[PDB]
Write an enzyme that holds these catalytic residues in place. Structure first.
Site, PDB file in Angstrom:
ATOM      1  N   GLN A  19       0.752  -1.251   0.000  1.00  0.00           N
ATOM      2  CA  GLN A  19       0.000   0.000   0.000  1.00  0.00           C
ATOM      3  C   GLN A  19       0.796   1.325   0.000  1.00  0.00           C
ATOM      4  OE1 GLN A  19      -2.324  -0.993   3.744  1.00  0.00           O
ATOM      5  NE2 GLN A  19      -1.839   1.078   4.409  1.00  0.00           N
ATOM      6  N   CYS A  25      -5.745   0.351   3.296  1.00  0.00           N
ATOM      7  CA  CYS A  25      -5.848  -1.019   3.806  1.00  0.00           C
ATOM      8  C   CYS A  25      -7.244  -1.608   3.573  1.00  0.00           C
ATOM      9  CB  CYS A  25      -5.493  -1.078   5.309  1.00  0.00           C
ATOM     10  SG  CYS A  25      -6.579  -0.066   6.276  1.00  0.00           S
ATOM     11  N   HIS A 164      -7.345  -1.322  11.254  1.00  0.00           N
ATOM     12  CA  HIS A 164      -6.638  -1.810  10.088  1.00  0.00           C
ATOM     13  C   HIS A 164      -7.495  -2.822   9.367  1.00  0.00           C
ATOM     14  CE1 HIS A 164      -3.498  -2.932   7.464  1.00  0.00           C
ATOM     15  NE2 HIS A 164      -2.998  -3.943   8.153  1.00  0.00           N
ATOM     16  N   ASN A 184      -1.881  -9.478   4.743  1.00  0.00           N
ATOM     17  CA  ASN A 184      -1.731  -8.060   5.022  1.00  0.00           C
ATOM     18  C   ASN A 184      -1.449  -7.368   3.693  1.00  0.00           C
ATOM     19  OD1 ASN A 184      -1.574  -5.695   6.544  1.00  0.00           O
ATOM     20  ND2 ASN A 184       0.529  -6.104   7.302  1.00  0.00           N
TER      21      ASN A 184
HETATM   22  C1  LIG Z   1      -5.563   1.263   6.890  1.00  0.00           C
HETATM   23  C2  LIG Z   1      -4.805   0.813   8.184  1.00  0.00           C
HETATM   24  S1  LIG Z   1      -3.020   1.115   7.921  1.00  0.00           S
HETATM   25  O1  LIG Z   1      -2.738   2.536   7.426  1.00  0.00           O
HETATM   26  O2  LIG Z   1      -2.330   0.107   7.015  1.00  0.00           O
HETATM   27  C3  LIG Z   1      -2.207   1.030   9.510  1.00  0.00           C
HETATM   28  C4  LIG Z   1      -0.824   1.346   9.660  1.00  0.00           C
HETATM   29  C5  LIG Z   1      -0.173   1.191  10.937  1.00  0.00           C
HETATM   30  C6  LIG Z   1      -0.891   0.758  12.065  1.00  0.00           C
HETATM   31  C7  LIG Z   1      -2.254   0.489  11.956  1.00  0.00           C
HETATM   32  C8  LIG Z   1      -2.922   0.638  10.700  1.00  0.00           C
HETATM   33  C9  LIG Z   1      -6.464   2.470   7.111  1.00  0.00           C
HETATM   34  C10 LIG Z   1      -5.733   3.697   7.730  1.00  0.00           C
HETATM   35  C11 LIG Z   1      -6.601   4.951   7.717  1.00  0.00           C
HETATM   36  C12 LIG Z   1      -5.971   6.160   8.357  1.00  0.00           C
HETATM   37  C13 LIG Z   1      -6.154   6.398   9.761  1.00  0.00           C
HETATM   38  C14 LIG Z   1      -5.548   7.548  10.374  1.00  0.00           C
HETATM   39  C15 LIG Z   1      -4.759   8.458   9.585  1.00  0.00           C
HETATM   40  C16 LIG Z   1      -4.582   8.223   8.200  1.00  0.00           C
HETATM   41  C17 LIG Z   1      -5.188   7.079   7.588  1.00  0.00           C
HETATM   42  N1  LIG Z   1      -7.551   2.118   8.028  1.00  0.00           N
HETATM   43  C18 LIG Z   1      -8.851   2.131   7.672  1.00  0.00           C
HETATM   44  O3  LIG Z   1      -9.247   2.417   6.556  1.00  0.00           O
HETATM   45  C19 LIG Z   1      -9.824   1.754   8.745  1.00  0.00           C
HETATM   46  C20 LIG Z   1     -10.240   0.317   8.452  1.00  0.00           C
HETATM   47  C21 LIG Z   1     -11.431  -0.207   9.206  1.00  0.00           C
HETATM   48  C22 LIG Z   1     -11.551  -1.653   9.086  1.00  0.00           C
HETATM   49  C23 LIG Z   1     -11.389   0.293  10.629  1.00  0.00           C
HETATM   50  N2  LIG Z   1     -10.940   2.746   8.668  1.00  0.00           N
HETATM   51  C24 LIG Z   1     -10.681   4.060   8.962  1.00  0.00           C
HETATM   52  O4  LIG Z   1      -9.532   4.420   9.305  1.00  0.00           O
HETATM   53  N3  LIG Z   1     -11.620   5.081   8.905  1.00  0.00           N
HETATM   54  C25 LIG Z   1     -13.037   4.891   8.519  1.00  0.00           C
HETATM   55  C26 LIG Z   1     -13.490   5.965   7.542  1.00  0.00           C
HETATM   56  O5  LIG Z   1     -13.226   7.311   8.056  1.00  0.00           O
HETATM   57  C27 LIG Z   1     -11.762   7.573   8.328  1.00  0.00           C
HETATM   58  C28 LIG Z   1     -11.188   6.513   9.244  1.00  0.00           C
END
Ligand SMILES: *[C@H](CS(=O)(=O)c1ccccc1)[C@H](CCc1ccccc1)NC(=O)[C@H](CC(C)C)NC(=O)N1CCOCC1
Length: 217
Positions: A19, A25, A164, A184
């Site tokens: 990604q 994600c 995530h 992942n």
């Molecule tokens: C993907 C998770 S990730 O970036 O690969 C990750 C890296 C390190 C540790 C944990 C996770 C995205 C990240 C979104 C994000 C969040 C904060 C700042 C910038 C980007 N996660 C999501 O899309 C999640 C997934 C769901 C299953 C919870 N959803 C989400 O973040 N949101 C829902 C829609 O509105 C915004 C936030």
């Protein structure tokens, strides 16, 4: 139910994607789940376009591209749009772009999606064995997850607050220790060639069964 299943063995899982610095994600978890249904229904395996979801399944679906989204509403976008393009025709840029979906390159459709009962790992187990890979959310906000190399992952600090989006492609045991096989989206260099084996039957560890869903062609 079998003691273990690994959908990679039945050619239903595409290669691990990377990604980059775009929080897509949720998009990868979503296409990964649809990719397996496509193979099961047409005998063919094609990686679908995560970029399509990042650019087109937006505000209306409560998604924010590189800033996050939901696998459930990403499925809804495919059902509404009557389709999603292949990765080959609509490549991943790790950036938010204008929706440039082209029906000419549609590689799959979706007729519906099912959401599983909160916290029920036994129901997730049946679904993974009978239906296919399931999209799930997990709490991956701990350095131990980022640093995972091999074995069955268990983080005593984990919570039910998921952040995530990943894909459960199987389950089994490692010398008796039960786990969920999880694909992942951080490249092949993360964990076991891109996968991580998370603790199963340890009280909804890291929220693994908190928000599960899978599509149907
Ligand atoms: C993907 C998770 S990730 O970036 O690969 C990750 C890296 C390190 C540790 C944990 C996770 C995205 C990240 C979104 C994000 C969040 C904060 C700042 C910038 C980007 N996660 C999501 O899309 C999640 C997934 C769901 C299953 C919870 N959803 C989400 O973040 N949101 C829902 C829609 O509105 C915004 C936030």
């Amino acid at each position: 139910l079998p003691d273990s299943v690994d959908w990679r063995e039945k050619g239903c899982v595409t290669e691990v994607k990377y990604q980059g610095s775009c929080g897509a994600c949720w998009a990868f978890s979503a296409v990964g789940a649809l990719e397996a249904q496509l193979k099961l229904k047409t005998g063919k395996l094609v990686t679908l376009s995560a970029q399509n979801l990042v650019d087109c399944s937006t505000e209306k679906y409560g998604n924010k591209g590189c800033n996050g989204g939901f696998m459930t509403t990403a499925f809804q976008y495919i059902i509404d749009n009557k389709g999603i393009d292949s990765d080959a025709s609509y490549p991943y840029k790790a950036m938010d772009q204008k929706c440039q979906y082209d029906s000419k390159y549609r590689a799959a459709t979706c007729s519906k999606y099912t959401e599983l009962p909160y916290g029920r790992e036994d129901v997730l187990k049946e679904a993974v064995a009978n239906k296919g890979p399931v999209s799930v959310g997990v709490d991956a906000r701990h350095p131990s997850f980022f640093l995972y190399r091999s074995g069955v992952y268990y983080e005593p600090s984990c919570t039910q607050n998921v952040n995530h989006g990943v894909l459960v492609v199987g389950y089994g045991d490692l010398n008796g220790k039960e786990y969920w096989l999880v694909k992942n989206s951080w490249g092949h260099n993360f964990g076991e060639e891109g996968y991580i084996r998370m603790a199963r039957n340890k009280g909804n560890h890291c929220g693994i069964a908190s928000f599960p869903s899978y599509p149907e062609i």
